[PDB]
Copies of this chain bind each other. A is one copy, B any other.
Amino acid sequence: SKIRIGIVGYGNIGKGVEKAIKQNDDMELEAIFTRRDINKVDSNNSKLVHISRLELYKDTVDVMILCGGSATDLVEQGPMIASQFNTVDSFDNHGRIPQHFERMDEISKKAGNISLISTGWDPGLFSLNRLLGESILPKGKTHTFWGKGVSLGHSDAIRRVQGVKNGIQYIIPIKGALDKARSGEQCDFTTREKHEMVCYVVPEENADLKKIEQDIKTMPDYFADYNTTVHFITEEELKLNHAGLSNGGFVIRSGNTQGGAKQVMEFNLNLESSAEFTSSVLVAYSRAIYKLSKEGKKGAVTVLDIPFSYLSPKTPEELRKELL
Contact = CB atoms under 8 A, between A and B. Distances in A.
Given A98-B321, A184-B270, A139 B23 contact: yes
Contacts of A259: 19, 273, 276
B272 A262 contact: yes
A269 B309 CA distance: 22
A319 interface: yes
A193 interface: no
A218 interface: no
Interface stretch (A79-87, A122-130, A198-206, A222-230): A122-130
Given A135-B284, A258-B22, A272-B263, A306 B307 contact: yes
The listed residue with most B CB atoms (<10 A of its CB), out of A118, A268, A309, A320, is: A320
A276 B304 contact: no
A262 B261 CA distance: 36
A105 to B, nearest CB: 11
A308 B319 contact: no
A152 interface: no
B131 A16 contact: no
> Is the interface on chain A under 10, 10 to 19, 20 to 34, or 35 or more residues?
35 or more
How many identical chains are in the complex? 2
Interface string A195-226: 00000000000000000000000000000000
A106 to B, nearest CB: 15
Nearest to A258: B19
A280 to B, nearest CB: 5
Contacts of A264: 269-271
A131 B309 contact: yes
B320 A97 contact: yes
A262 B134 CA distance: 30
A277 interface: yes
A101 B318 CA distance: 13
Contacts of A276: 257-259, 261, 263
7 contacts: A131-B323, A136-B281, A257-B276, A261-B277, A263-B276, A267-B267, A304-B320
List the 5 closest A-B pairs by CB distance, nearest first: A19-B258, A261-B273, A135-B311, A257-B276, A264-B270
